Amino acid sequence: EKENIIGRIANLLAVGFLYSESPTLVDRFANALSKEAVTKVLYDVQRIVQMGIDRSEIATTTITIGKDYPAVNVNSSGAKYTVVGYLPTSQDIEDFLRMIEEDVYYARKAGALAMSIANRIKLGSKQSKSE
Amino acid sequence: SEKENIIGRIANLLAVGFLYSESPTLVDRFANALSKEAVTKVLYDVQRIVQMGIDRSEIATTTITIGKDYPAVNVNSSGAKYTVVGYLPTSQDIEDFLRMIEEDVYYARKAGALAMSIANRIKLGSKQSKSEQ
Amino acid sequence: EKENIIGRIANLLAVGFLYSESPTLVDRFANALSKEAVTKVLYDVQRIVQMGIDRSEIATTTITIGKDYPAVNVNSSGAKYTVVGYLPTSQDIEDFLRMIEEDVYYARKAGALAMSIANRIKLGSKQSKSE
Amino acid sequence: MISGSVRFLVNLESLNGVESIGNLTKHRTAPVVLKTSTGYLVRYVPVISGEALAHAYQASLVDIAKKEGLPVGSLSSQYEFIKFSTDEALKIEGIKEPKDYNDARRFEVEVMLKDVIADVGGFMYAGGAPVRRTSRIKLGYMIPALRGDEIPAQLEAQNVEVSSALYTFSFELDEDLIAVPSTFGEKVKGEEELERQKAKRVKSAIKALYSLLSGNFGGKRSRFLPSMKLMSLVVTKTDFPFMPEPAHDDDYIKTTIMRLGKAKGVLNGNLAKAYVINNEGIEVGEGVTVLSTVEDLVVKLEE
Amino acid sequence: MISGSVRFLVNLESLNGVESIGNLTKHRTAPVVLKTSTGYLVRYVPVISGEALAHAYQASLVDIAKKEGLPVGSLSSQYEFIKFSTDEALKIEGIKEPKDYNDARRFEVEVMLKDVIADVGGFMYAGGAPVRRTSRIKLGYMIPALRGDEIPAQLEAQFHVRFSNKPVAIFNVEVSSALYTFSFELDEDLIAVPSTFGEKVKGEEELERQKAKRVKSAIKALYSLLSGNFGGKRSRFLPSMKLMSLVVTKTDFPFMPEPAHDDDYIKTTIMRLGKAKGVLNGNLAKAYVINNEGIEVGEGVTVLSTVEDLVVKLEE
Amino acid sequence: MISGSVRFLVNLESLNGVESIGNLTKHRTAPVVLKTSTGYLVRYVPVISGEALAHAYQASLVDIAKKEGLPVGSLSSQYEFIKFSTDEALKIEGIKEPKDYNDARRFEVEVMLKDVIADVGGFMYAGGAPVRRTSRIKLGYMIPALRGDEIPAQLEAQFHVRFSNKPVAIFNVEVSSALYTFSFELDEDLIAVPSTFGEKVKGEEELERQKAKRVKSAIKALYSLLSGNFGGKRSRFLPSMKLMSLVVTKTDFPFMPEPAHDDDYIKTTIMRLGKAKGVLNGNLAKAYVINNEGIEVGEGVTVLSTVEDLVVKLEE
DNA sequence: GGGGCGGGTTTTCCTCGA
């Protein structure tokens, strides 16, 4: 369940990064040495995602990868991205903050996963444009 | 085995990062790692170097005929051209590799040894072709 | 092709021994009873060779022995040595490790060849200094 | 050396903006540590960067130099202070890159004869033969006074953020190094022109401070023009290193005057003068010249 | 000896830098172990290295020596303190390398009569006959006070852009605010005195003549450190500094004042100084205290107002 | 005997060094076995060797002896403690080597009347008739407290550059921060007493006369160790030290206080001291405690404030 | 709009005796 929480936080960070086109929040999250820095990023990334939701540029969907998987569609600057997985719940944020209060290592783990998701999606999108 | 394929793809990532940066420092850190922290830090830093090479169009995926087409990565560094044969790791390969490291840090040494072998063979071949020309 | 791989591994061990002036890695290789010991030596010897390459004290060359043969020049402590042959490729290391996973005997064979190369070169270098 | 501390009173201004989130423009804020009877508190307070002040000062210097006749660079003629950093700027200006260390001085002199801004404000060249010239004018962030147990600063939203506060800031300027090469080496042709123009360059640099001391800086002045007013100002002219006390405590003129006297006593100084402008009726002391406006201060400094 | 403990309050600060990642300039950070009511904890806090303080002190000493006529080395005339470590420096200055051990003293004297910086801050020469000279001024890292359960320090990042009419220019700078504390030690009884053991060598008379001036210059050079003239990035990030507490002790025997971590560190160090003078059979022990925060001091203690008065008293 | 346990808190520290790799200077590290709720684990933690502490103690003893008029050896006058191991030292000092076993005592006395360092810290001579003298002061490695499941220690590397106007200058330094603990033992009842068995030899009367002064100097020399004057790299990496807990026991029988690893190690050692005095038929057992962290102490225990008071009480 | 450059360490000692 700890890995599932970390994976859902990583999906939130990856969606926020792909939508904003800025690594700054993921950099802040992966370099955090206090609960203050982690919590500030968790707010700021959700505030970016909230704007994308209100603009209908961020939406939940299902995608067939032959069973349907939960996904998040992100439209940014005319690029379309799809992140596979769920976004964190309020309980996931609270349980993740409790994990951070024990060990800030979990912020680095979530940041490393988020950057991996974003890099793979950006590479695939650039390859399809070149073809 | 799927574990060997993951290790081989991590070794390709480390070799691409080494050839592009011209620095062994990340491979040295990876092969000497005694904790998951050191391994994960190198996996980020090498991918960050590869990301810059991708954005500059100095790192690109390609196919090469060695008579079937094999996946490869072209690397341009300091006017030298290198070609690493194989795939780069997926996000799932990084995650499964980190789980292997959480069980046994030996797999970081195995990937580092393979990465240095790939880089050494490519550097030797590139120096020989320059001496002949 | 197995003998060619073993010969290229023996050349790597001989170059590492002549450059480091230490038999310790060849001793470890020839006494190996596990893939762990063999793989550790293959890394450590290549790490020594990498330092010699960066210092330009180890270089590939050709030598006429009337056709040109591939060779490796080694400069150590003001002594000059020349090992005749190629260094192993990444594929040779991988195929050699597969041979070791079947039978650790091949590490003893490569170690015996490496020590023979190094001994012949050291004897010739001492004779020329005495003359 | 000319050092100074100044206190301003600003109401309903938005002069420096930072990264915007959604449809809201954010004012710059920084943390500060404040001492109270109960202990220490960490408070977030609006601030203004010093780079904007430097930009305004350099723009005023460019305008004054162009009006006078001193040389100005091609790019610097436009309000784009990239200076001689990249090869493109050198190509546009038409200056050969340095060859080795021995030639560095020459290169510097050349640049120093083509742009007054590159002289007063310094510059940096990165490459095979890097070159440097530290700025002759030093500024810092603008922070409200951290006096008492209450910070007299407010910030609100209107979306646009608008603030109000009692700001304070200090500045330094060394006029003894203007029109002087900062690299060690044999003399090269062209230094005579620099010696000739030293006086004019120094006068222009001194004059340029009027813009900052008057309140001509910051952005968003088209629709959010602020209402500024000067309250307290201290300026010191010496021949040795010195720095007046920050304008945080109510009594910082007397302390700086006493410290100036004792510093002249200790450091074997020869010249030490102080000018004070007071409008809030705070303690001053004795043996100090009292002015009425900033123009008189500028005239006296020039004289 | 002169031993001092100083407390400073600095806001919106960036004087020390480390390796940069991407477009972000980072501030030096170090781990600290702190005691709370629940036990002991480990935290990461911004710090400032002591090498910057040493460089500032040596530059001020160079300026004072040049103003007062004392000799200054050719390379040390420019603010590059390589001293006499490598052979290139010796060739530039023009001093022959030592031949054997017995000649080492001579070499030291030759180094000591040309640059005051080598005399005060020490130097090293590596070779067949290595020569060592320990610095006569000792400093340390600048650490904020570890008082209570909350560390009074904070670090953040700031956003900056460069204007251009033809976009084709964005960076971040780390800024910290804290209440720093640091201590220093300076033994003036060994200035202008050779350290290598050996026989008498011609040229010591000049050192004896110049000893008083060298000691006076070394004492004067502390004004820059006590005032706040150190660190980098002062062109656009000039910090706001304010002295809060200062203790200075002059003794004829080794002594170390208490670190400025607790609110009561003046009474304790004065009592310890008295008892140490009693127990170690000393003959001189004086203390000076500058207080601006209204904390407990004690009785029978000289109280000053500024730092210049302290410098004058130390010189006299 | 005098047996002590001391706890220190040190931040941004590098006093002990080991072999260097590349441009990196490394800090000494050792393995430790620690007990957690899940069992037993092995960790690698920075440590400080006891030889540096012994060198600092011996240097302070040399200074005190020279100040008080006690004899000091020629080689030991310079801070080089080779003592009388080799024949070159004997030739320099001017002491004839022992002839047979029966003469060994005489040689010991000749060594013992010239250098207090040989008397206190012991010495060795190897040859036809070897002579041994065990040190009267015993120290150990400085290890951080192994309390709880998390070790309160940290180690990192720092980046430094050397400025030069003509690049053709980069190094790294290891810095640690921890809460160190260490114990020491000193038996003052055997100072100025020959150890080799034999017959009476002329010159013991002078030793009996000087015994009191030697004991006083040996007791005084502990002030440097208890204050924090030890280790290297103090010129640019001066550490911040602060005493937290100290226990000192004076007994007429062998005794060892509990190590400073657990939060409750004063009550336990006091109870053990009482029971040991009861069971071993002793006649003297005194304890002194210095506490600054508010941990449990006990009842009927003398409480001090500083270290100088402890030194004075031990001397009296 | 996803920075650039110059630096990646130099000596000295490698056990003595029964």
XYZ file of N, CA and C in Angstrom, chain F residues 174-292:
357
model
N 36.287 15.755 3.677
C 35.217 15.065 4.386
C 34.942 15.751 5.721
N 33.662 15.953 6.021
C 33.217 16.644 7.225
C 32.140 15.802 7.896
N 32.243 15.656 9.216
C 31.338 14.821 9.990
C 30.720 15.623 11.128
N 29.591 15.133 11.626
C 28.920 15.723 12.776
C 28.316 14.604 13.610
N 28.587 14.610 14.914
C 28.169 13.492 15.750
C 28.126 13.910 17.214
N 27.664 12.973 18.039
C 27.652 13.091 19.495
C 28.589 12.009 20.027
N 29.831 12.394 20.300
C 30.885 11.458 20.659
C 30.855 11.143 22.151
N 31.381 9.968 22.498
C 31.547 9.561 23.888
C 32.881 8.844 24.024
N 33.533 9.025 25.174
C 34.785 8.312 25.408
C 35.064 8.232 26.902
N 35.889 7.256 27.270
C 36.250 7.008 28.657
C 37.766 6.969 28.797
N 38.235 7.250 30.011
C 39.665 7.294 30.286
C 39.935 6.776 31.692
N 41.171 6.327 31.903
C 41.609 5.807 33.191
C 43.032 6.273 33.465
N 43.303 6.617 34.723
C 44.632 7.075 35.122
C 44.891 6.648 36.559
N 45.909 5.817 36.763
C 46.297 5.358 38.097
C 47.478 6.203 38.569
N 47.224 7.079 39.535
C 48.245 7.981 40.050
C 49.067 7.377 41.181
N 48.720 6.177 41.648
C 49.454 5.542 42.733
C 50.754 4.892 42.276
N 50.982 4.782 40.969
C 52.205 4.192 40.443
C 53.103 5.202 39.741
N 52.748 6.488 39.758
C 53.593 7.508 39.151
C 54.860 7.676 39.978
N 55.996 7.822 39.290
C 57.305 7.979 39.924
C 57.671 6.774 40.783
N 57.280 5.578 40.338
C 57.622 4.335 41.012
C 58.215 3.386 39.977
N 59.420 2.856 40.187
C 59.992 1.917 39.216
C 59.154 0.654 39.101
N 59.138 0.083 37.895
C 58.352 -1.107 37.614
C 59.182 -2.374 37.461
N 60.435 -2.264 37.030
C 61.285 -3.437 36.869
C 61.749 -3.933 38.233
N 61.605 -5.236 38.464
C 61.986 -5.824 39.738
C 63.503 -5.929 39.848
N 64.018 -5.663 41.044
C 65.450 -5.717 41.263
C 65.807 -5.161 42.628
N 67.069 -4.770 42.765
C 67.590 -4.215 44.002
C 67.558 -2.692 43.963
N 67.769 -2.088 45.129
C 67.760 -0.636 45.227
C 68.938 -0.037 44.473
N 68.684 1.080 43.796
C 69.685 1.771 42.991
C 69.668 3.245 43.372
N 70.856 3.831 43.513
C 70.963 5.239 43.866
C 70.231 6.108 42.851
N 69.499 7.095 43.356
C 68.678 7.964 42.537
C 67.194 7.850 42.802
N 66.765 6.876 43.609
C 65.347 6.751 43.923
C 64.889 7.822 44.905
N 65.820 8.389 45.677
C 65.461 9.453 46.608
C 64.948 10.682 45.870
N 65.584 11.031 44.747
C 65.105 12.152 43.947
C 63.711 11.881 43.399
N 63.457 10.648 42.957
C 62.125 10.287 42.482
C 61.092 10.418 43.596
N 61.440 9.972 44.805
C 60.527 10.117 45.934
C 60.269 11.585 46.247
N 61.298 12.425 46.128
C 61.119 13.854 46.360
C 60.184 14.475 45.327
N 60.323 14.083 44.063
C 59.569 14.686 42.973
C 58.232 14.006 42.707
N 57.889 12.962 43.464
C 56.657 12.218 43.211
C 55.425 13.116 43.279
N 55.358 13.984 44.291
C 54.183 14.834 44.459
C 54.011 15.776 43.275
N 55.103 16.403 42.834
C 55.025 17.315 41.699
C 54.651 16.578 40.420
N 55.198 15.377 40.221
C 54.847 14.600 39.033
C 53.370 14.230 39.031
N 52.842 13.816 40.185
C 51.423 13.476 40.275
C 50.562 14.705 40.008
N 50.943 15.849 40.577
C 50.184 17.075 40.352
C 50.179 17.460 38.877
N 51.334 17.359 38.214
C 51.403 17.686 36.794
C 50.569 16.719 35.961
N 50.614 15.428 36.295
C 49.823 14.445 35.560
C 48.332 14.719 35.710
N 47.898 15.086 36.918
C 46.490 15.417 37.124
C 46.118 16.683 36.359
N 46.994 17.692 36.379
C 46.714 18.936 35.669
C 46.624 18.726 34.166
N 47.392 17.779 33.625
C 47.436 17.594 32.178
C 46.102 17.143 31.591
N 45.189 16.617 32.412
C 43.897 16.162 31.914
C 42.978 17.306 31.497
N 43.317 18.547 31.848
C 42.461 19.677 31.501
C 42.357 19.850 29.993
N 43.463 19.651 29.272
C 43.431 19.784 27.820
C 42.505 18.752 27.189
N 42.566 17.508 27.658
C 41.683 16.473 27.125
C 40.228 16.753 27.475
N 39.968 17.234 28.692
C 38.592 17.497 29.095
C 38.039 18.784 28.492
N 38.895 19.641 27.942
C 38.443 20.905 27.371
C 38.160 20.805 25.879
N 38.987 20.079 25.132
C 38.767 19.924 23.709
C 39.930 20.365 22.843
N 41.143 20.329 23.389
C 42.343 20.725 22.653
C 43.033 19.469 22.126
N 42.490 18.940 21.032
C 43.064 17.767 20.385
C 42.618 17.737 18.932
N 43.323 16.935 18.139
C 43.007 16.766 16.736
C 43.726 17.762 15.842
N 43.655 17.491 14.537
C 44.283 18.312 13.531
C 43.278 19.052 12.658
N 43.825 19.772 11.679
C 43.033 20.607 10.775
C 42.199 21.624 11.550
N 42.805 22.216 12.577
C 42.146 23.241 13.374
C 42.330 24.645 12.815
N 43.155 24.811 11.777
C 43.404 26.146 11.242
C 42.211 26.663 10.448
N 41.577 25.799 9.655
C 40.444 26.192 8.832
C 39.166 25.425 9.137
N 39.227 24.377 9.954
C 38.071 23.554 10.298
C 37.930 23.445 11.809
N 37.985 24.581 12.493
C 37.853 24.601 13.942
C 36.471 24.093 14.343
N 36.379 23.055 15.164
C 35.072 22.479 15.490
C 34.371 23.238 16.606
N 33.073 22.967 16.728
C 32.235 23.524 17.783
C 31.931 22.411 18.777
N 32.509 22.509 19.970
C 32.379 21.483 20.992
C 31.592 22.016 22.183
N 30.858 21.116 22.836
C 30.054 21.481 23.994
C 29.902 20.259 24.887
N 30.331 20.384 26.140
C 30.211 19.296 27.099
C 28.752 19.066 27.463
N 28.379 17.796 27.604
C 27.010 17.426 27.940
C 26.900 16.615 29.221
N 27.810 15.673 29.453
C 27.758 14.849 30.653
C 29.154 14.332 30.973
N 29.466 14.275 32.266
C 30.780 13.838 32.714
C 30.648 13.153 34.064
N 31.276 11.984 34.190
C 31.330 11.245 35.447
C 32.787 10.926 35.750
N 33.217 11.208 36.979
C 34.579 10.929 37.420
C 34.517 10.182 38.744
N 35.284 9.099 38.847
C 35.301 8.254 40.032
C 36.733 8.101 40.520
N 36.933 8.316 41.819
C 38.223 8.143 42.475
C 38.104 7.001 43.472
N 38.905 5.954 43.274
C 38.821 4.752 44.093
C 40.221 4.271 44.441
N 40.291 3.428 45.468
C 41.515 2.733 45.841
C 41.568 1.309 45.309
N 40.564 0.890 44.554
C 40.453 -0.446 43.992
C 40.073 -0.332 42.525
N 40.374 -1.352 41.720
C 40.015 -1.294 40.296
C 38.513 -1.138 40.101
N 38.144 -0.320 39.120
C 36.745 -0.037 38.825
C 36.650 0.560 37.429
N 35.522 0.304 36.769
C 35.283 0.822 35.428
C 33.857 1.344 35.306
N 33.671 2.641 35.083
C 32.316 3.178 34.929
C 31.673 2.707 33.634
N 30.345 2.753 33.620
C 29.598 2.318 32.451
C 29.856 3.253 31.270
N 29.906 2.711 30.053
C 30.081 3.566 28.875
C 28.888 4.490 28.682
N 29.152 5.645 28.078
C 28.125 6.663 27.867
C 27.279 6.370 26.631
N 26.715 5.165 26.569
C 25.854 4.771 25.461
C 24.373 4.865 25.791
N 23.995 4.622 27.041
C 22.610 4.702 27.473
C 22.362 6.016 28.203
N 21.106 6.466 28.168
C 20.746 7.709 28.841
C 20.912 7.618 30.352
N 20.789 6.424 30.923
C 20.932 6.209 32.362
C 22.228 5.433 32.591
N 23.334 6.166 32.731
C 24.625 5.552 33.016
C 25.337 6.212 34.189
N 24.653 7.063 34.946
C 25.228 7.655 36.150
C 24.718 6.957 37.405
N 23.404 6.751 37.496
C 22.851 6.017 38.628
C 23.411 4.603 38.685
N 23.503 3.944 37.528
C 24.021 2.584 37.479
C 25.463 2.525 37.970
N 26.306 3.459 37.518
C 27.709 3.405 37.907
C 27.893 3.782 39.374
N 27.043 4.663 39.906
C 27.131 4.993 41.331
C 26.743 3.791 42.186
N 25.651 3.109 41.820
C 25.260 1.914 42.560
C 26.330 0.832 42.464
N 26.902 0.648 41.272
C 27.960 -0.340 41.101
C 29.190 0.026 41.917
N 29.514 1.319 41.998
C 30.636 1.758 42.822
C 30.399 1.446 44.292
N 29.194 1.733 44.787
C 28.893 1.421 46.176
C 29.000 -0.062 46.470
N 28.405 -0.889 45.607
C 28.455 -2.331 45.826
C 29.870 -2.881 45.681
N 30.660 -2.342 44.750
C 32.037 -2.790 44.587
C 32.886 -2.422 45.795
N 32.684 -1.223 46.348
C 33.379 -0.866 47.580
C 32.970 -1.792 48.717
N 31.687 -2.151 48.776
C 31.242 -3.075 49.807
C 31.869 -4.451 49.675
N 31.991 -4.945 48.443
C 32.373 -6.342 48.243
C 33.889 -6.512 48.202
N 34.623 -5.507 47.727
C 36.062 -5.632 47.534
C 36.875 -5.153 48.730
N 36.222 -4.759 49.823
C 36.895 -4.302 51.039
C 37.796 -3.099 50.750
N 37.186 -2.059 50.181
C 37.873 -0.821 49.898
C 37.839 0.135 51.082
N 38.477 1.290 50.883
C 38.526 2.304 51.928
C 38.332 3.716 51.389
N 38.069 3.880 50.094
C 37.889 5.206 49.514
C 37.142 5.069 48.197
N 36.053 5.823 48.056
C 35.264 5.796 46.827
C 34.499 7.107 46.733
N 34.889 7.967 45.793
C 34.252 9.261 45.610
C 33.831 9.427 44.157
N 32.744 10.166 43.951
C 32.187 10.380 42.623
C 31.867 11.854 42.417
N 32.106 12.333 41.199
C 31.771 13.688 40.788
C 31.025 13.629 39.464
N 29.957 14.416 39.358
C 29.070 14.386 38.203
C 28.851 15.804 37.704
N 29.026 16.003 36.398
C 28.686 17.249 35.724
C 27.592 16.937 34.716
N 26.446 17.599 34.865
C 25.271 17.335 34.044
C 24.763 18.635 33.445
N 24.520 18.625 32.132
C 23.975 19.791 31.448
C 22.814 19.438 30.526
